[PDB]
Ligand binder design. Structure first.
Ligand SMILES: COc1cc(C)c(CNC[C@@H](NC(=O)c2cc(C)on2)c2ccccc2)cc1C
Ligand SMILES: COc1cc(C)c(CNC[C@@H](NC(=O)c2cc(C)on2)c2ccccc2)cc1C
Lengths: 451, 449
């Protein structure tokens, strides 16, 4: 995280005169020479979802043509208002918008976190104005994204995290028993980030309808994969607006939508639901201020990359892309299930979590780390995951992963008490008082802003 | 664009050629670019130079995959962010704080304002026992304060201004309660471009032991240099002990690409209340310095590139140009007695009239090609001067168009054409109606027909 200490001149103060552009560019391209092989060659779990040179180059030029655009001035850039409205319209359609009576509306945001915070804040504001709730509560599974905790703390919503079943899918009974007259929303993930499992969405959406509460499908990860997994012959239940009780769905264009980082979509079943997301200031000397998302000034150029990506790919592009990923996933799962010292948690389609009842998975992960792998460290239970992308569908990437894993297992199988590098860090963290995890994370964030 | 371009309400079956998509975006670009390139737009675009944009777009291209949530993959971007903070903190007299000044890179001024609000709320709850937070801001303070207030559940007490459109500190002193967690001042405020009495506000804040956030979103990259050039600017940054947090935008006058700002806290004890930490999540340990998870790291590299390419001499020259251009603009405006400048702003000029309908004067300018901001309470229009306004004859043209605008309205005092009666209605309308028309506008914006 800090390897450019000696390599390049640091800057704690603005230089008196301006440094040449060639020089500035020379540094960035040199860091890109060190950093791009990790993602380009397929060693990172998620992080970069497309990664083709011509696709990246395509979206860079897209960015360049629209680099000055800011949606806060639709008068000046009506193209960006077109791009945003058109991204929303298309995403909505792909997530059963027609089924919901053509009332599905939404806005383009910065990321899945924004989408989840905005949905969480909307249900709060909606339930206070229409249900009278002043002490909101949200029932979500333990596997639901960390952002649910963010929204809770921020918006003063009580978050009730409910257990999972033997398949790591949400326990609807536990969800039902958690519902009180103050529950404003219940959520399910399509799929979750931890183990890549699609929660039982039809049963969650029916539960929300029965109590007259909201149902949010966090499809930030599978929004642009599951519609195409369905059409390919893979087991995927209806998870979107085709379900009567589903009131909002988030899906990330910057993830498997293959857009530049900095874009997501938040969808609501009806406009009356959407209007509660907005903030309107009527008495400010600065004029009438109306904002649909968290931010005022928005990078318009990134809405254009989301639009460009969807249009460049089309339904055929997504089917191809999804098939490649699920076949890489089929092959990867087959190999892990062929090393009986390791187990896959639940039955994921492409975000594969691997744990071990016989050995220290953290050390296994470290062995892979030494081979160049950038895997996601997981706890509760201690495991690691591989979120497969188009970067892992490239020639011999899954074969390299499988080879490196057979070796990784063997090394730990030969030295069960081995804990090198990051392995004793994950081990101390998995069983640590929350305040210790608080003091270290704080220290780590501080470590990133040092000069 | 209704029929100008083909609508896309559904994904096409097969993907459209990449060359085809670019051509459509470039078509839309070419119709939209002259409006800001010829300096007709007040603010919105702050640098606008072809060679700078090309430089910054090459920087984007090299860091496009960058996502700061993965510092292990992009250590380049953790360096850029740390460095954008450091350089900013130093420019805003963070050295006077004794090197304790720290901060983070954000998506814009709104996120920086919201973050500070959430932070003072959390800080005050943890350390003072405040469960009903209250915040005191002048009425001139940004609308993001109201957004921040509704989101985090902080009572926002908006205080009146003085005859010079600066904050009435006495009004703010009488607004402070034991539930007040923070005060704010704008350097400058968006409406009338004036700098609030920040020393007096920080002195009030320090006296009460509550935070003081300075909204330097618009002026953080202009005011340090206005001072160096001898212009009168009240000390507004970390030079003042009472100032506990300062927010500034690199995407505005910092000349970095859109989607970046910086929030600075005087102490790390304060900054730590901004961070989000999750410990029991099956997905691992999750930490986030700001609101976001994933972020476009490429935008942080552009702020780092811009800053280093300009340095002190660059920002001084850029500011010299803008302030001189504004000196000329205020002089010309002052020479049209039917109009008045609200307060004494350095470069964000707000012109209003007690004789003619300013909304009609503004309508006349729109007709000539000028993109100006509508302001109510009082009715007025503002011009945020940028580098595009420093180009030859831009200011001269504005004043010719403005002299003509005043000539017309003076002849026809009942004239209410184009957007002029829309603004007129909105300044007179009840809040419930303003809420409804604005909601319909957001819906309008997201319509596919
Ligand atoms: C009630 O009728 C309205 C409604 C509106 C919205 C307006 C325009 N105000 C201008 C306002 N921009 C928006 O709020 C905005 C955001 C998005 C997206 O699109 N526009 C604004 C600009 C800069 C700084 C502060 C505010 C004017 C009348 C008469
Ligand atoms: C020192 O204790 C820590 C502390 C941390 C933060 C970590 C990394 N967890 C991985 C975690 N990334 C961060 O939260 C993050 C944010 C920034 C900036 O940088 N990293 C994560 C990301 C995405 C999805 C799920 C999880 C590991 C140990 C051992």
């Amino acid at each position: 995280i800090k390897p450019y200490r000696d390599r390049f001149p640091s800057h704690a103060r603005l230089p008196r005169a301006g440094l040449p552009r060639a020089e500035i560019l020379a540094e960035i391209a040199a860091m890109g020479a060190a950093e791009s092989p990790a993602w380009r060659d397929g060693y990172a779990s998620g992080a970069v979802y497309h990664g083709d040179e011509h696709h990246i180059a395509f979206l860079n030029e897209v960015y360049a043509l629209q680099s000055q655009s800011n949606p806060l001035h639709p008068d000046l850039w009506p193209s960006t208002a077109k791009f945003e409205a058109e991204v929303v319209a298309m995403t909505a359609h792909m997530l059963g918008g027609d089924a919901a009576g053509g009332t599905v509306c939404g806005t383009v945001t910065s990321g899945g976190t924004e989408s989840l915070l905005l949905a969480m804040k909307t249900y709060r504001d909606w339930a206070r104005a229409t249900k009278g709730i002043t002490a909101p509560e949200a029932v979500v599974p333990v596997s639901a994204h960390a952002a649910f905790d963010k929204a809770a703390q921020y918006f003063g919503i009580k978050l009730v995290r409910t257990p999972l079943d033997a398949d790591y899918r949400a326990d609807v009974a536990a969800m039902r028993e958690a519902i009180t007259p103050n529950t404003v929303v219940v959520a399910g993930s399509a799929p979750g980030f931890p183990h890549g499992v699609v929660d039982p969405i039809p049963e969650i959406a029916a539960l929300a309808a029965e109590h007259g509460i909201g149902c949010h499908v966090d499809a930030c990860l599978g929004g642009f994969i599951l519609p195409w997994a369905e059409r390919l012959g893979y087991p995927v239940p209806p998870f979107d607006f085709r379900l009567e009780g589903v009131t909002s769905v988030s899906a990330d264009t910057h993830k498997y939508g293959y857009g530049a980082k900095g874009t997501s979509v938040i969808l609501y079943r009806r406009p009356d639901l959407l209007h509660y997301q907005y903030f309107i200031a009527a008495d400010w000397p600065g004029g009438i201020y109306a904002s649909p998302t968290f931010a005022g000034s928005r990078p318009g150029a990134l809405s254009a990359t989301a639009w460009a990506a969807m249009l460049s790919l089309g339904e055929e592009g997504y089917l191809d892309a999804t098939r490649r990923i699920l076949q890489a996933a089929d092959r990867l799962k087959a190999g892990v299930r062929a090393i009986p010292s390791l187990k896959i948690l639940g039955d994921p389609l492409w975000v594969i979590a691997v744990a071990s009842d016989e050995l220290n998975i953290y050390q296994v992960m470290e062995e892979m780390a030494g081979r160049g792998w950038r895997l996601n460290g997981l706890h509760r239970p201690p495991a690691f995951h591989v979120a497969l992308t188009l970067r892992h569908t490239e020639p011999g990437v899954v074969d390299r992963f499988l080879a490196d894993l057979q070796d990784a297992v063997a090394q730990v199988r030969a030295h069960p008490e081995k804990a090198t590098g990051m392995a004793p860090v994950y081990g101390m963290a998995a069983a640590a008082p929350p305040e210790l995890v608080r003091q270290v994370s704080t220290g780590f964030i501080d470590l990133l802003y040092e000069v």
